Each structure stands twice: as C-alpha cells, then as structure tokens.
Amino acid sequence: DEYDYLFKVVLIGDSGVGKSNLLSRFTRNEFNLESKSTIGVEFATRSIQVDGKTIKAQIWDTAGQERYRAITSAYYRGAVGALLVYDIAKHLTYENVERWLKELRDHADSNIVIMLVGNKSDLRHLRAVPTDEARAFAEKNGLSFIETSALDSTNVEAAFQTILTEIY
Amino acid sequence: DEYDYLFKVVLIGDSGVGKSNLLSRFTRNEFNLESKSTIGVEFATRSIQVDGKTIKAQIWDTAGQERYRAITSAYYRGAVGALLVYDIAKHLTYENVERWLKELRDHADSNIVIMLVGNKSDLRHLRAVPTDEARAFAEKNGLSFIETSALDSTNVEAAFQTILTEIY
Ligand SMILES: Nc1nc2c(ncn2[C@@H]2O[C@H](COP(=O)(O)OP(=O)(O)O)[C@@H](O)[C@H]2O)c(=O)[nH]1
Ligand SMILES: Nc1nc2c(ncn2[C@@H]2O[C@H](COP(=O)(O)OP(=O)(O)O)[C@@H](O)[C@H]2O)c(=O)[nH]1
C-alpha cells in the first residue's frame, strides 16, 4: 500500500538448508518441521522499518529444480540483495558456498549485496561448520555474516534487517 | 532453455478452493490434504510435448494475502490463460466468481483464455453448487467449464490440456 521503497532479496543455497523457512519465518512468522517449500519459485513480502523508512522486503525462494533461461533470469532480475544460506550442521552445504557465490557472479546484477547465512544454529550440538571458519570466509570475500535459526527465530529478523540496511 | 513456447497460466479464486493442489497436480500429479499452499505468490513449470513441439506451461498460484500494485500487476502480466476456481461444496466461493472475473477484466490481457473450474468434485455428497448452473454461467460469459477433483485426480489433467489447447 503506502511505503517508501521496495527491495527484492533472493535466497540461494543447497536444498534443505532452510531457505523456505527463513522466508516463512521472516514474512509470516511461520515455521515448518515438515517442509512446505515451493516446488518452483515463490516470493512473499514483509514491511519493515529501516532508518525510519518503511520498506517492503520482497523475499524470493526456489527449489532450484527449474533452471531454464527464462526462470533463472526472472529469479535474479532486479534483486538488490541475496542471502547465501548453508546448514551449520551439514558441512557439504558450506563446501558448496563457493559455487553459489560464482552462481551469483554469473547471473546477479553487479550491485547486489550478498550476505552469508549459517542457518540451523539451534543444532549447534551437532555443529559441522565452525563459526570462525565461515566468518573468515565471509570477510575475505567482502560480505556480511550471521548465524540464524528459522526454528527458534534467533537472528532471523536481524539477518534481513542487516542486509536491507546495507542495501539502503 | 530448449522449448518452443512458454505459456503463463494463473490460478485465481477464493482461498481454500484447492488452487495450490491443482498446481501440484498439474506439475507433479501430487495432492496434499494438509495444504502446502504458497504464503505469497509462486509459480512452477510443467513441460508438455504437443505437435512435435515442446511447451512450457508456467503455472502461477497465489495466497491472495499480499495486495499492492506492484505484485498485483506482475501476477497477471503476460498470462495467456486463467483458471478461475471455486469449491463445489462451498456456495460462497462460487458467488465470488463474478468478482474474480472482474479482476481479470481490468488486470489481465483482454484476450486471456479463461476456464471456470469447479473443484472438489469428490465431495459430491456435500455439493452446494449445481453443475448445470455453473455451466450456464460459463456459457453466458464465454468461459470454458469443467469440474475437477485435485484429491482423486478427476479431470485435472484434462482441465490443463483443455485450456492449453485453447491457448495454443
Ligand atoms: N533445526 C532446524 N531445522 C531447520 C531450520 N530451518 C529449516 N529447517 C528444517 O530443515 C529442513 C529443510 O528445510 P527447507 O526450508 O525446506 O529448506 P530449503 O530446501 O533450503 O528451502 C526442514 O525439515 C526444516 O524444518 C532451522 O533453523 N533449524
Ligand atoms: N476433498 C477435496 N479437498 C480438496 C481438493 N482440492 C483441494 N482440497 C483440500 O482443501 C483445502 C484447501 O486447498 P488449498 O489447495 O490449500 O487451496 P487454495 O487455498 O485455493 O490455494 C486443503 O485441505 C486441500 O487438501 C479436492 O478436489 N477435494
């Protein structure tokens, strides 16, 4: 309705890291243990205050199954921010971060803000990716970093708040 | 990208009529009693080889929640087809059809192909909307008509095939 800006932010990362739940957690405060992730591409909006300004954060997610030219273009088109997500309890998903970074470099707009997100922090008892290793990688590649839990909500609001503030 | 044509078809109608399940049926022949409907807007693609050609039917669905210019325009933009859905066991969802037809009128392309769909035909013992009446309304408005059951699959693939044939 009435707002100041509209920013599109896309979620990327291995399937199963919790992208659909970061989306639902942030935009509707909903979480599902048994995934209700999109079968294709999905986006939902959340209005949030940033520096007094009302921003409509339109968050995108995908199963990544469909990759024909048209859909891949539509996904990144206009995106001013990207949350590159991995699962702190699954090292493989972090090992794939390098590839997702290249993906963004090959399809995203040049001015896109990227933030590395280690999701499922509530599973720290089974941690597979040391916070320090991920943070160091984040710094060396010039991008913000934070660990979240869509499950218990820790840092979810902060994560989007941060990337949105970096874009504005 | 190796198809011949890309047709965008949108699903509209009251929430709870079964749109997310028509989408899951059309794309993966799957049905969920426990709704996995999108929380905002989502689209998935179904590939079908017809006339030696290969067509990608990009089906869109909506939660109907988010309602702000930007997204409303993007929803109908480029759509060559529309499935206007109601629940045959809930008379109110049928009453709203006329109002849904109005939204297509001033938001969708004038030449968009519209098919009226009476879903949940498996709940015949709870029917609230007589078939002949719905069909008469469709007839008078120049709309195709069919009753489906995303739950037991009846006429779902046929409804899809019908509108695509009308669009192609
Ligand atoms: N423990 C835990 N599970 C999570 C978290 N976020 C998502 N999940 C779960 O992990 C699975 C995969 O999540 P899904 O959201 O479908 O992620 P996607 O495939 O990346 O989009 C589901 O079982 C979720 O309930 C989280 O922060 N903590
Ligand atoms: N009996 C019956 N239930 C259905 C049918 N299609 C969908 N449903 C159910 O009715 C509810 C509403 O469906 P949902 O797909 O989320 O429709 P939406 O809100 O229009 O997008 C869900 O519990 C579905 O499982 C159908 O053909 N028959």
CA dist., res. B10 & res. B1, Å (int): 21
CATH number of the A1-168 domain: 3.40.50.300
Token code pair at residue B98: 């006329």
Token code pair at residue B47: 């590939």
Method of determination used here: X-ray
The gap from C-alpha A59 to its chain's centroid, in whole angstroms, comes to: 8
Query: How would you classify residue B13: left for phi > 0, otherwise alpha for psi between -120 and 50, otherwise beta?
Result: left
| Residue whose entry in the numeric block shows the structure tokens 């809930």 | B90
- Residue among B55, B54, B75, B65 at smallest CA distance from B11: B75
Resolution of the solved structure (Å): 2.0
Helix axes of A97-107 and A69-76: crossing angle, nearest 10 degrees: 90
In this complex, the residue of A41, A58, A69 whose CB is nearest that of residue B1 is A69
The residue in chain B having the minimum alpha-carbon distance to the alpha carbon of residue A56 is B68
Determine contact: A66 vs chain B, CB below 8 A: yes
- Residue among B136, B19, B139, B152 at smallest CA distance from B75: B19
Q: Percentages helix, strand, coil for chain B, rounded to the nearest 5?
A: 35, 30, 35
CA dist., res. B73 & res. A1, Å (int): 13
- How far, CA to CA in Å, does A38 sit from each of A15, B22, B42? 11, 14, 7
CA dist., res. A44 & res. B81, Å (int): 23
